[PDB]
């Protein structure tokens, strides 16, 4: 229970943020990041009621001032929920221009962004449209190779889902200097769909989004795999290869030299 004077003051802030489009934000709003109990203060400001312009500014103010751990709650509790809500409720299932920027500012802190936006989304029923919009934000904005590799490593172990494949391929599309550990994990991920005892992943139908992802790995990291790993991947194409993409992958895999 915040002070009654404070509640009325921030209740005015909640009204301010609903229609705010430009200018200077309220001074009380700008000092919320310093406050320990921001959760109570932010709630009375009605984050769901924030205008798209406010959401963009709020991510800038809060991601910058705050610790890494707290910023995760913001990206998870507010930005992520707003990101899903706008896509679901929009007529064309598109994301607003300001919210689109807000995700980029969250990516300013990679560790908070991945554990607050990416991993919660893919693990909470992400849809293809959500992955495409979020993936493009990941595609255009710069990320460290170390942080990207950890995110790429995390995605692989998760059970195969269409949203998970989109995020994996984009990270592969970034042309990163993946650690030698990360390359092996990517190789293991693609092996698990080859028929052998094995799980359903061997027999599960594979969309092209898997094949496109696998082609990108072959195109860029053919020189970063061992000869034995190349053999397992080649067997995977023989068993699960696509009609048109599969021949291309085999050409790329065979063209790479063994580490």
């Amino acid at each position: 229970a915040l002070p009654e004077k404070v509640i009325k003051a921030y209740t005015t802030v909640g009204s301010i943020l609903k229609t705010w489009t430009h200018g200077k934000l309220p001074k009380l709003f700008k000092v919320i990041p310093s406050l320990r109990n921001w959760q109570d203060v932010i709630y009375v400001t009605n984050p769901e009621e924030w205008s798209p312009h406010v959401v963009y500014e709020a991510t800038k103010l809060f991601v910058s001032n705050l610790t890494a751990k707290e910023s995760q709650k913001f990206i998870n509790l507010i930005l992520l929920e707003r990101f899903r809500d706008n896509i679901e409720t929009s007529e064309d299932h598109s994301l607003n221009y300001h919210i689109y920027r807000a995700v980029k500012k969250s990516l300013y802190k990679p560790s908070a962004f991945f554990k607050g936006f990416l991993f919660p989304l893919v693990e909470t029923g992400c849809n293809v449209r959500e992955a495409t919009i979020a993936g493009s934000v990941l595609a255009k904005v710069s990320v460290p190779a170390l942080h990207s590799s950890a995110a790429l490593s995390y995605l692989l172990r998760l059970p195969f889902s269409p949203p998970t494949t989109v995020f994996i391929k984009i990270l592969l599309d970034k042309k990163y200097a993946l650690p030698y550990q990360t390359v092996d994990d990517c190789v293991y991920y693609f092996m698990r769909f080859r028929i052998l005892s094995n799980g359903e992943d061997a027999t599960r139908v594979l969309p092209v989004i898997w094949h496109k992802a696998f082609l990108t790995f072959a195109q860029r990291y053919k020189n970063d795999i061992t000869q034995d790993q190349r053999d397992f991947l080649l067997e995977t194409v023989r068993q699960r290869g696509h009609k048109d993409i599969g021949p291309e992958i085999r050409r790329e895999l065979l063209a790479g030299a063994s580490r």
Binding site: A9, T12, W20, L28, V31, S111, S153, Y154, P179, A255
Partner: protein
């Protein structure tokens, strides 16, 4: 049509005034809020509350440290097919030939001076010059440090004078090794020219001006064997 437009213009102006009126009300609320900032802040501080990571969060932090330990792989580009490479090569050749037709129609120390290179290579044999000059380029690549482009650019002028300088020196004793150096140095100069042709061009003209000035006093005695070499190198580069 005009009546509809006037309604449209009136509606746009009407909404514009409403947005301005809201903005006029908007700033006043901020101004009042800012004035009461101290009172709101004071109560909030008095009510400040008194003083485990998820298993997912713990794993991710562990992964980052482990990934830092491991070595990093270099990323490669997709291999282009032979037909695409041939098509790209043909297009570049077709482009380059066309512009030519239009023009027809109208530890290791980098020596900033030619003398410095001799001091570095003074104790080395004649056949060792390609080794030393190549090392200087590797030791001072553009990426290694800032200003290496300028140092390499100056070295291009230095290397050119060296090629001409060696030709002036007598070499009938060991023509074979001397042949093994001039072509080797020239090949390096060709690579250097591709990046520092501006620097090479400036040095070449000055030699021409120097060439003229020495001809203005000595006639044929100024002319030398390396002078013939110099005109040849320009043709290559």
């Amino acid at each position: 049509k005009a009546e509809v437009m006037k309604e449209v213009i009136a509606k746009s102006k009407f909404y514009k005034q409403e947005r301005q009126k809201a903005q006029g009300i908007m700033e006043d609320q901020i101004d009042n809020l800012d004035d009461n900032f101290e009172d709101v802040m004071s109560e909030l501080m008095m009510t400040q509350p008194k003083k485990p990571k998820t298993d997912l969060d713990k794993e991710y932090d562990i992964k980052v440290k482990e990934l830092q330990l491991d070595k990093r792989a270099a990323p490669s580009d997709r291999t282009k097919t032979e037909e695409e490479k041939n098509a790209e090569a043909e297009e570049k050749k077709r482009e380059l030939e066309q512009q030519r037709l239009d023009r027809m129609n109208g530890s290791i120390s980098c020596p900033r001076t030619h003398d410095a290179l001799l001091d570095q290579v003074k104790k080395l044999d004649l056949d060792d010059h390609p080794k030393i000059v190549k090392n200087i380029i590797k030791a001072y690549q553009p990426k290694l440090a800032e200003g290496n482009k300028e140092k390499l650019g100056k070295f291009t002028a230095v290397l050119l004078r060296h090629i001409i300088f060696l030709s002036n020196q007598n070499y009938l004793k060991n023509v074979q090794s001397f042949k093994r150096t001039q072509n080797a140095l020239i090949s390096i100069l060709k690579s250097l020219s591709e990046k520092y042709n501006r620097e090479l061009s400036e040095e070449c003209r000055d030699y021409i001006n120097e060439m003229q000035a020495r001809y203005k006093k000595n006639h044929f005695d100024a002319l030398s064997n390396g002078d013939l070499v110099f005109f040849s190198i320009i043709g290559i580069l």
